[PDB]
Structures are given as C-alpha cells and as structure tokens.
Design a protein around this ligand. Structure first.
Ligand SMILES: Cc1ccc(OS(=O)(=O)O)cc1
Ligand SMILES: Cc1ccc(OS(=O)(=O)O)cc1
Ligand SMILES: Cc1ccc(OS(=O)(=O)O)cc1
Length: 285
C-alpha cells in the first residue's frame, strides 16, 4: 500500500486514487481522468467516482472554398457543442450519480459530490458550502457563451452537451443560431481569416477549446464479477459558416448546422474492483 495514493476518510473507510491520461493528436483531445475507489466496511457496494477533465480542441478553422463560383466564398468551421459521455454495457455496473445533474447556464460551473460513510452520496451546485462529508470531489469549468445540458442519463450511460447559446458581438448579443454570427466584411488583403470575427471577439470555447470537468459514480455489487469495462467519449459537433462577398450587395452568410457530428475520441477503460486498478483497453485513435 506504500506506493498507492490512499486517503483515510474515517473509521473503516478509505479512498484509493488512480489516474489515467490518454490523448489523441488526431482528434485533438486529452482525457485526464481520476478514478477514486470508495472502500467502506459499512457500505455493501463498491463505488468508483470518476472525474473527467482534460481538453477538447475547438478545431476552429478558416479556409478558402475551392471551385468555380466559390472564389469569394470563405468557410469557418467551429464547435457548436462539446460532447462528454461515459457509457457501460456490463450488467454488473450502474451509474448512481452524475454532476452536473441539471441544465446549467452560468459562465462558471462549480459543484461538489460529497460522500458520507454508509453509502451516502450528495451533490450541491456550489463549492465550499460544506465541511460535513467524509470525502468530496468537485467539478469546475468555464463555458462563456455556452450552456450545459444532460442529453442522456440512465443507469448505464450519462452524456453532457456544452452547447453554443448566446454571444457578445460589436452589434450586441447574438443567438448561437444567427447565420451572421462571427461574419464580418473584410478584398483589401482577401484572406479567409478576414471574413470572420478576429480572435479577440471569439470566446475561449471557439478560439481554443473546452476544459471539461464532469463526475459520475459507478456502482458495483461486491460478489459480482471482478471487472467492468466502460467508455469515456470527449469530442465536438462542428458547424460551418459560409461567407460570400458580393461586391455590389455586401457579405452574405449561410450556416450549415450540425455539419460534422460526433467527432469524438472514445477510450475504453477496465476497472478491476478486486485489485482497485484501472487499465486502458482500447480507443479509436
Ligand atoms: C474538416 C475537419 C473538421 C474537423 C476536424 O477535426 S476533428 O473534429 O477532430 O475530426 C478535421 C477535419
Ligand atoms: C478546407 C476544407 C474544410 C472542410 C471541407 O468540407 S466541407 O466543409 O464540407 O466543404 C472541405 C475543405
Ligand atoms: C452529447 C454526447 C456525449 C457523448 C457522446 O459520445 S458517446 O458517449 O460516445 O456517444 C455523444 C454525444
């Protein structure tokens, strides 16, 4: 036990802390995942608190459009939604909590999952409210201009979507569905980049990417089989904005919504409930 990260959380209980870091340069994703085993002599089930952090590249790009008739048409690809999900198919595991649990629209998200000896979990949509738990884990992320929704939740899977909502533009607030979002008149230098809002008008989730912070707890009956597999998916859905310069009537824009869906990096992990170990089994790199 000397070379394992173990926290004593009270009489008869401890937490075994594991981590995995799995990246894909092709998908532009890093999964930095924490897997905390709750070991409690007064709780008849095993529990693994999984905290999903890392990075999902926005994959925003600006390009020329090839072909006759498209010489004054430029393309901006950008992420309408970030996808984060954890799924299992094993009968021996179920999801017993998830955070965030409800839709959250604030720029900052900060929530806590608390555990008390005897199998008691609680969640709160804030950080620093309680010093009452035997163990706690928190999530924290910023999602300026985007909102978080639970797109799917059930005993085997949880999926969150962090979706474009409303943006601050020089002309005022703009809906994420406004076909003229990010479009501007550049030509003088005629670069594809100049047909779209400069980097200082693009919020972090468009310019750079998203740093997820989500939790779900896996539950396993002691006495069922030693291992379970589960998949964690991080990715994005991209929209396209096309901007065409008509020298006599100005800039014209068209949006292709959900242009590239589920561009996701999916990693399959195995939890060994008996040895308190996590292994990477596969991925779609
Ligand atoms: C055209 C295009 C758009 C996005 C790309 O990155 S992906 O989302 O990681 O697949 C790659 C090519
Ligand atoms: C540079 C580039 C990027 C995306 C492309 O696919 S499209 O948007 O469906 O035309 C084609 C070329
Ligand atoms: C919103 C959302 C979240 C995760 C997704 O990937 S999956 O878990 O591999 O299906 C897809 C959509």
């Amino acid at each position: 036990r000397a070379n394992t990260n173990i926290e004593n959380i009270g009489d008869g209980a401890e937490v075994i802390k594991r981590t995995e870091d799995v990246s894909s340069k092709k998908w532009g994703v890093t999964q930095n995942v924490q897997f905390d085993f709750v070991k409690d002599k007064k709780y008849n089930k095993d529990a693994l608190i999984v905290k999903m952090q890392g990075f999902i590249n926005s994959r925003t790009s600006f390009s020329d459009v090839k072909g006759s008739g498209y010489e004054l048409t430029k393309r901006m690809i950008w992420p309408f939604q970030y996808n984060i999900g954890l799924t299992t198919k094993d009968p021996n595991v179920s999801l017993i909590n998830y955070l965030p649990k409800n839709k959250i629209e604030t720029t900052d998200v900060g929530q806590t999952l608390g555990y008390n000896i005897g199998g008691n979990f609680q969640s709160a949509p804030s950080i620093g409210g309680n010093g009452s738990f035997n163990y706690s884990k928190t999530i924290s992320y910023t999602q300026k201009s985007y909102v978080s929704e639970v797109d799917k939740q059930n005993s085997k899977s949880v999926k969150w979507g962090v979706k474009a909502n409303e943006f601050v533009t020089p002309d005022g607030k703009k809906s994420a569905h406004d076909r003229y979002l990010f479009v501007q008149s550049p030509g003088p230098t005629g670069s594809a980049r100049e047909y779209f809002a400069p980097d200082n008008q693009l919020p972090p989730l468009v310019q750079s990417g998203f740093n997820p912070s989500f939790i779900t707890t896996l539950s396993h009956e002691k006495g069922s089989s030693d291992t379970s597999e589960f998949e964690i998916s991080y990715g994005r859905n991209l929209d396209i904005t096309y901007a065409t310069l008509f020298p006599r009537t100005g800039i014209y824009a068209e949006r292709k919504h959900n242009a590239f869906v589920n561009r996701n990096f999916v990693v399959r992990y195995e939890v060994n409930w008996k040895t308190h170990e996590i292994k990477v089994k596969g991925h779609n790199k």
